[PDB]
Amino acid sequence: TVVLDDVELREAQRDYLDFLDDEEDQGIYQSKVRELISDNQYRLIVNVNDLRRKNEKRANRLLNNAFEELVAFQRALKDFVASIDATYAKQYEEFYVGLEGSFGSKHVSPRTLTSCFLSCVVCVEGIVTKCSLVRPKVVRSVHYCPATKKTIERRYSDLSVYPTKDEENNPLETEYGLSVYKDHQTITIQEMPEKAPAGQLPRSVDVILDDDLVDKAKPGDRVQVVGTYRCLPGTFRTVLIACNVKQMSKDAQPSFSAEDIAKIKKFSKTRSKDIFDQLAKSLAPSIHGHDYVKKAILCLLLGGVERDLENGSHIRGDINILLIGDPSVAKSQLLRYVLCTAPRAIPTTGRGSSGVGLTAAVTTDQETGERRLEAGAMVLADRGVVCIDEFDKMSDMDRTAIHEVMEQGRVTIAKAGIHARLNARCSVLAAANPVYGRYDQYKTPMENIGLQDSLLSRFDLLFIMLDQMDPEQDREISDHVLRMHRYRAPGEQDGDAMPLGSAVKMVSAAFMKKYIHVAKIIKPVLTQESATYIAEEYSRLRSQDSMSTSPVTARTLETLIRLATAHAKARMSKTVDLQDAEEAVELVQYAYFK
Amino acid sequence: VCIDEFDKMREDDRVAIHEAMEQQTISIAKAGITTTLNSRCSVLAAANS
Amino acid sequence: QLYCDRYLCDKVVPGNRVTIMGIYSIKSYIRVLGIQVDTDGSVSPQEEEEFRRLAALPNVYEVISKSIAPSIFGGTDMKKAIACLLFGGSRKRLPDGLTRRGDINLLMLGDPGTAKSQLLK
Amino acid sequence: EIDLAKLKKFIAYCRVKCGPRLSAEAAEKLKNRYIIMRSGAPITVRQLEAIVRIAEALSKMKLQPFATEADVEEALRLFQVSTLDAALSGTLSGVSQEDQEMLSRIEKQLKRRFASEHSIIKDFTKQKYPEHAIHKVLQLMLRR
Amino acid sequence: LEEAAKEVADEVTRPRPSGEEVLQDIQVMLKSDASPSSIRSLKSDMMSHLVKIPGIIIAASAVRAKATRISIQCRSCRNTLTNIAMRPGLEGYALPRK
Ligand SMILES: Nc1ncnc2c1ncn2[C@@H]1O[C@H](COP(=O)(O)OP(=O)(O)O)[C@@H](O)[C@H]1O
Ligand SMILES: [Mg+2]
């Protein structure tokens, strides 16, 4: 029962070796392995379309039967490396093949990863949520039998079972040096939260990483991994075995349609100056007033541009706004607008996400008693937006943890013997009612809620809205409210209300969402004129600081710079403008001065 | 929804009813994805304290 | 117990009114084969005429208030509030696409000794 | 008078058939009345929407596509009965300038005392202060 | 009916691109305009009989994987029973006697 020859494997290995034999051709893969040898790694990367071009049949054979074809491929790779250099091949017991390129049907998402893809290559794109600790997995254990003076081996691979006795019950001692071990980490991927329906459920897919692939991933990373989707031994559980991992850019881009780009460019070139004000009016038209707040919310969505210095600095471009006001004010309604409006947002309560909370947390599995580093709500909002309601009700641990992300944009955790430093750069829109309602304009904003004044320093902007009993103002709001009440769709007969379905001038939210996404790609830079202008404005504000919100400081200066940068995005200007700084200056003056 | 002793809700239920009255929806967050269940239901609460 | 395996599976969330086509089975469960979802909504002329008649009554408010809970004792415009909750407001759609709750929610604080449990029932 | 099932059938029929809107004349009547309550005060924008929904519920009884000023008057009558009920309930609950004032007094007296736990709470309670107000002040100082 | 859907789909789309040439199974989902039978109007008579009923879902499970086609090996003898179909439904498995 000993297999002698596999002609299919023989030919398939030769076909790869011919493909790897890149000397008659441009040398791209021959150079890659040469660079790989210089790199001293043992995992070549491969574009599938090259294989398709050189042999469509072989590439189809590979994708339809990932396992055996890769084994032939790794055979060819090791042989090819040994051809170029035997001793370097002898350094490593094996080599590995990383796939890359286009996959028509096999490029899917965890939502769309069907069971049909079992045993096929698949390029799953998604977001990391959970990561396990790095552990050394034993694959091949060498044992020695002094009684027989005999060496025995065993391979586990996909296959209590750890042998310790000879068949004659001689003791066996494990040659730890000769035995083969490899670091091995497990992570979980989910669909990108922006592009996922609320009706459906999560589709979490488990990924296995080995060797160099182990720590090329962290929780809250947007990645695509190519691997072999497989079942597990026993109704069965299914996991993906990674063949190559890459962290795609989290910014991505607004592809959409060129029609959207043309409409955006047409609208932008229509009135570039009024686009900021027009968007603000159409940002939250269901709520009358708070127009400066709407301007700031727009600034938050567009945000600034991060500056990183020679000293490893990461001077943030994000903007953080806090809103305080008595209950029964549209604060909650504002957040619903932002969630519907923002390109990449995520809501959360004062409690935070269940268990994990705002930032990440370490959770044992409790199914096998296994530690897992779970990303929190804040981490998933990286390079996005987070909306926090009942921000006053934040827990004390979270009240401390918010400091790091607000300052550095990165959360760290060394607890439970588990070491991680995750990215959480996220412009945050927080809101909190005053305690006992009934805000008083005599105490600090902190004293009405309690924030320690570190958070208030951290927040770029703070806006206070009060339930003033002005009959004129209340008439304006109430008349607006009743106008929304009286409003009926053009197609309707004033009769029945909308059906109870199971599913869930003024510009559209979607088009606005498209435009801000396009604007977010824009990278407005500074102008010497505006830089001079704002510097005078800041020093003027320092002069205004003589009068006795927080005093103006260098925090406020950088807040203005991001605000002008955000307005620079709003008009799509490739540089900031005096209009941008001027709009920011009046906005800040409105915030600190009523 | 007739609720006798609405004061005696569960703490998680107390969290959930907030969004429920505020949005007629129950949101359950599993990591990033947060599924939503529609509850456009009137409520007749009763209590003593 | 319903059992959906292929693309039929994952098409629904709990709480939706639906109609399933399947196979009655026992291990007691269903081998479902087709699903229809009540994505919107879900009357004899006599009933219509009666409700047209009843609404036209001038004291339809008062009769509805009195008629609902004569069994219970100690009710004065609480019956009216219970009615208006049952009728409920309009689930308005805002011009920009947002929605407001069409419901009305009432709280009955006070004496647990009073037979409001019967009223809830 | 009307049957239990017949009431249910009417309730479903009107709901599925009629979502009333607000007539402009009824709306402005409520608007001016809403300002009067604000000036008299309490009334909030949430209460304004709640009154609007109640008026729609009232007009839905009569199946009117629009809610009349009389329908608004009916809702305001019921709401004002709830508002008077709300005033005495706020008196019962203590949830408000006077509530703000006594909480400040509680804070000042506690700072005077210090800056058992049961005895402190009982003595504060015996000083004509609610336990919930005491507990709220305790939580705030811990947060602060 | 599924096999009929399989063949007619194949011949209709006979010239598939390379790699796509492999034919995939088809779920012939069904529907009808017939009146749903009340859930209470259900007895053992309609077991293994097509039924259509209304309802409202109370709970849902996660999207899991269940085995349709399986193969097993005799641990000692190496005897392999290949491509064993597992009946659709909420069943377990069936092990050979030897
Ligand atoms: N300026 C306004 N314009 C329109 N509606 C408002 C305004 N202020 C408050 N509201 C009303 O307040 C309600 C939402 O209040 P919410 O934001 O939940 O209160 P809070 O955020 O203080 O808990 C909405 O129904 C909305 O109609
Ligand atoms: Mg709120």
Structural features, described:
The structure is cut from a larger assembly and holds 1 copy of chain A (594 residues) and 4 copies of chain B. Chain A is an alpha/beta fold and 594 residues long. In chain A, 37% of the residues lie in helices and 19% in strands. Chain A contains 19 helices and 20 strands. In chain A, the strands form 4 sheets. Chain A has a 5-stranded mixed beta barrel with strand order 4-8-9-11-10. A 5-stranded parallel β-sheet of chain A has the order 13-16-19-12-20. In chain A, strands 1-2 form a two-stranded parallel sheet. Chain B is of the alpha+beta class. In chain B, the strands form 2 sheets. Chain B has a two-stranded parallel sheet with strand order 1-4. A two-stranded antiparallel ribbon of chain B has the order 2-3. In chain B, β2 (25-29) and β3 (34-38) form a beta hairpin. Chain B is elongated. The two termini of chain B are 20 Å apart. Chains in contact: A-B, A-C, A-D, A-E, B-C, C-D, C-E. At the C-D interface, α1, α2 and α3 of C face α1, α3 and α4 of D. β4 (44-46) of chain B pairs parallel with β4 of chain C. Chain E: It is found in: Nucleus; Chromosome.
Strand order of the largest sheet of chain A: 4-8-9-11-10
What about the largest sheet of chain A?
5 strands, mixed, barrel
Report strand % of chain A. 15-25%
Number of strands of chain B: 4
Distance between the termini of chain A: 89 Å
PDB class: replication
Keywords: complex, helicase, replication, AAA+ ATPase, DNA binding protein
Entry title: Cryo-EM structure of a human MCM2-7 dimer
Chain A: DNA replication licensing factor MCM3
Summarize the structure.
This is part of a larger assembly, with one copy of chain A (594 residues) and four copies of chain B. Chain A is α/β, with parallel strands linked by helices and 594 residues long.
Write out key terms for the chains shown.
part of a larger assembly; 5 chains; A: 594 residues; alpha/beta; five-stranded parallel sheet; 19 helices; 37% helix; 19% strand; elongated; B: 49 residues; alpha+beta; two-stranded parallel ribbon; two-stranded antiparallel ribbon; binds adenosine-5'-diphosphate; binds magnesium ion; DNA replication licensing factor MCM5 (chain E); phosphoprotein (chain A); helicase (chain A); nucleus (chain A); acetylation (chain A)
